[PDB]
Amino acid sequence: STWRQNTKSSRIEAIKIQILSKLRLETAPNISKDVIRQLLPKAPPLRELIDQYDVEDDDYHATTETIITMPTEPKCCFFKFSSKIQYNKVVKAQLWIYLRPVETPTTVFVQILRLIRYTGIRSLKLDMNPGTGIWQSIDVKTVLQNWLAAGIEIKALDENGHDLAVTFPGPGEDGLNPFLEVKVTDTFGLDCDEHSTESRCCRYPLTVDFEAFGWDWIIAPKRYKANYCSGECEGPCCTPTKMSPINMLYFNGKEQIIYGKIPAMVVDRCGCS
Amino acid sequence: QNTKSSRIEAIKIQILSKLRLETAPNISKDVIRQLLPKAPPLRELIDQYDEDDDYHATTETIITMPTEKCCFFKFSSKIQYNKVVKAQLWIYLRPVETPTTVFVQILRLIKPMKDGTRYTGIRSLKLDMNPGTGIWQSIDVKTVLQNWLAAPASNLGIEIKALDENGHDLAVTFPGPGEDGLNPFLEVKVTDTPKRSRRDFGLDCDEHSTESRCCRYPLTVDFEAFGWDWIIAPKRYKANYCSGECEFVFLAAYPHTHLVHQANPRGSAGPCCTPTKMSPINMLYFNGKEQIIYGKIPAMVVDRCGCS
Ligand SMILES: [Cl-]
Ligand SMILES: [Cl-]
């Protein structure tokens, strides 16, 4: 009997305290088998509740809400192909472009085309005044989805034919490159036997027998597989990372028989935390 | 503490594992200056950084025997009437010697209404019984029970009669010899809604404390200190960590029910100090694949420590 048997014993003591605590009982109901014979109804609802004992979510990895893609590195602009994205998971897709500040007030003709051999997606007419450059966002949700089930040209010319759109950024144009802003809606264990030589954090078998405790106030289940965790972690602590409930039919010691769901009574998985 | 020197290493591995990155993206501050857009969406994402009771059991069915002329039912707790899904009164009619008709009558006992009466009709049944065995009869009493749970009434008294063709009562109310578990009872099915306590407590002692018990200690994860410039935001966050001894606690029944506590100042492999509640963090980062990603990383902050 090593540290593992000390973990098995303390698990049995924990289950005993947990059962009364979770069932809101200060003490184990003082009801003998002789009293249960008189009070337990010999009726279909009890037989049914007793006969029942004869018979997915990724919460670890991160969830990507927004993806911002810069153009791949002369020609412009081609976008990424590495990240996996769904056709119907796209909530919003906007192409952001920066227009350089103008020396004199002019009209700006913005033209975005999807390359194949050329199909128009959006055309804008802007009025720009001297002072500062401006960020223009273009809805590309329909196009972004169309390419997911399988190159963007950007032009922003003023009245003189000069292109104001920053595609390949010149000196002092840091963080002014075009980009796609895409918003999306996207959301085991180790088991051992009692005599395992395994030193790592592991799940071991444990059957809890309420008749062995003398807890006759519990009608069903008379026994259940509770399991326990034991092993070295090198968090530095072998604990359950997944637990499941049990249904219990019991005498509450207040002239009542209750059927209920007790959470976290069975160890499903062990881990280091 | 060495538990902090190992928690920092765990956070580093967790961040890359949860973000599905084999290695930390190799992007310098010089490259970040060129690629990070000085645009409204990036300004909106960066500017953002400036309990349901899962412990106690759920009650699904309550079976109540009559309180110890028949029959009175006393509930240990009067549940909200709208939580009642089903309420049935179960009655046992004794086996008959010859085949007869049974007139079953269940009445609610009310306070005398002077001119009215002292008894209210719930249900009336007619059934044909043949020799061989007794049967169990269930009577719908949901309306009566819900009205009682919503009323400023103390007790629920129900009169039960089940007479055959000779006037003999077949219903078991007060069980005679060999009639164990044949008494009348209420079967009530409920939808127990878990009442949250709204957590705001837990042992979160300071770093200079001499506390030996399982405790939550402060820990700030500075990504600039790691040289992880690929993380745009947050540049710093409070992750915290658990440390401390967990004593053995045993249930004892004599002379009265109580808990016995025992020290665990060594590695005796009993209970262990671990996080019992954790929270996520939102991260704006360069994935190293020409993309900037905003996401939610779960279980990055230790909120509460406990013994397990
Ligand atoms: Cl056992
Ligand atoms: Cl209802």
Domain stops at, among B192, B209, B236: B192
Q: Are residues A12 and A68 in the same domain?
A: no
The SS3 of residue B134 is coil
- Strands in B46-134 per DSSP E: 58-64, 72-73, 84-93, 100-109, 119-129
How many whole angstroms separate alpha carbon B290 and alpha carbon B278? 31
Residue B217: which of B256, B244, B179 has the closest Cα?
B244
Q: Are residues B32 and B64 in the same domain?
A: no
Q: Residue B180 has what DSSP assignment?
A: T
Touching check for A14 and chain B: CB below 8 Å?
yes
Query: Are the Cβ atoms of B57 and A262 closer than 8 angstroms?
Result: yes
User: Counting Cβ atoms within 10 Å, is residue A50 exposed (0-12), middle (13-18) or buried (19+)?
Assistant: middle
How many whole angstroms separate alpha carbon A228 and alpha carbon A248? 20
Experimental method: X-ray
Q: Are residues B22 and B70 in the same domain?
A: no
Who among A22, A236, A273 is closest to B55 (CB)? Answer: A22
Q: Are residues B74 and B34 in the same domain?
A: no
How many whole angstroms separate alpha carbon B98 and alpha carbon B130? 7
Touching check for B3 and chain A: CB below 8 Å?
yes
Query: Are the Cβ atoms of A39 and B289 closer than 8 angstroms?
Result: no
If you search the block for the tokens 């499903």, which residue do you land on?
A268
How many whole angstroms separate alpha carbon A192 and alpha carbon B182? 47
Q: What are B240's two structure tokens? A: 């915290």
CA A200 to chain centre: 26
Greatest alpha-carbon span in chain B: 103
Q: Are residues B84 and B166 in the same domain?
A: yes
How many whole angstroms separate alpha carbon A204 and alpha carbon B136? 45
Residue B92: which of B159, B142, B162 has the closest Cα?
B162
Greatest alpha-carbon span in chain A: 103
Q: Are residues B77 and B175 in the same domain?
A: yes
Are the beta carbons of B240 and B265 closer than 8 angstroms? no
One-letter-per-residue 3-state SS of chain A? CCHHHHHHHHHHHHHHHHHHHHCCCCCCCCCCHHHHHHHCCCCHHHHHHHHCCCCCCCCCCCEEEEEEECCCCCCCCCCCCCCCCCCCCEEEEEEEEEECCCCCCEEEEEEEEEECCEEEEEEEEEEECCCCCEEEEEECHHHHHHHHCCCEEEEEECCCCCECECCCCCCCCCCCCCEEEEEECCCCCCECCCCCCCCECEEECCEEEHHHHCCCCEEECCEEECCEEECECCCCCEEEEEEEEEEEEEECCCCEEEEEEEEEEEEEEEEEC
Q: What are B23's two structure tokens? A: 């290695």
Q: Are residues A159 and A113 in the same domain?
A: yes
The CA angle B279-B283-B289, to the nearest 5 degrees, is 140
Q: Residue B174 has what DSSP assignment?
A: S
Are the beta carbons of B294 and A65 closer than 8 angstroms? yes
Output the CA–CA distances (angstroms, integers) from residue B128 to A263, B98, B172, B175, B183, in the order listed: 46, 11, 17, 23, 21
Domain stops at, among A147, A167, A186: A186
Q: Are residues B62 and B176 in the same domain?
A: yes
Q: Tell which A residues from 123 to 162 touch B, by Cβ distance under 8 Å.
A: 135, 137
Residues 6+ apart with CB under 8 A from B168: none
Q: How many domains does chain A have?
A: 2
Q: What are B155's two structure tokens? A: 């007790």
Are the beta carbons of A86 and A184 closer than 8 angstroms? yes
How many whole angstroms separate alpha carbon A78 and alpha carbon A73? 8
Domain stops at, among B192, B209, B244: B192
Could you tell me how many CB contacts below 8 A there are between chain A and chain B? 212
Q: What are B166's two structure tokens? A: 């000779």
Residues 6+ apart with CB under 8 A from B179: B92, B172
Q: Are residues A258 and A209 in the same domain?
A: yes
Strands B58-64 and B185-190: antiparallel
If you search the block for the tokens 């009530």, which residue do you land on?
B188
Q: What are A73's two structure tokens? A: 């590195």
E strand or H helix that includes residue B8: helix B2-18
Domain that holds residue A212: 1-55+188-273
If you search the block for the tokens 């947990």, which residue do you land on?
A18
Nearest residue of A to residue B288, measured between CA atoms: A82
Q: Are residues B64 and B19 in the same domain?
A: no
Query: Are the Cβ atoms of B41 and A252 closer than 8 angstroms?
Result: no
Buried b (16+ CB within 10 A) or exposed e, B16-40: eebbebeebbebeeeebeebbbebe
Buried b (16+ CB within 10 A) or exposed e, A3-16: ebeebbebbbbbbb
User: At CB < 8 A and 24+ separation, what contacts does A114-121 make?
Assistant: A114/A143, A114/A151, A114/A152, A114/A153, A115/A151, A115/A152, A115/A153, A118/A153, A121/A152
How many whole angstroms separate alpha carbon A202 and alpha carbon A230? 5
> B57: which chain A residues are within 8 Å (Cβ-Cβ)?
22-24, 248, 260-263
The CA angle A119-A122-A125, to the nearest 5 degrees, is 135
Q: Are residues B33 and B139 in the same domain?
A: no
How many whole angstroms separate alpha carbon A153 and alpha carbon A145? 18
The CA angle B127-B123-B90, to the nearest 5 degrees, is 70
How many whole angstroms separate alpha carbon A139 and alpha carbon A124? 12
Q: Are residues A42 and A82 in the same domain?
A: no
User: Counting Cβ atoms within 10 Å, is residue A131 exposed (0-12), middle (13-18) or buried (19+)?
Assistant: exposed
How many whole angstroms separate alpha carbon A96 and alpha carbon A177? 8
Touching check for A195 and chain B: CB below 8 Å?
no
Touching check for B35 and chain A: CB below 8 Å?
yes
If you search the block for the tokens 């590309």, which residue do you land on?
A140
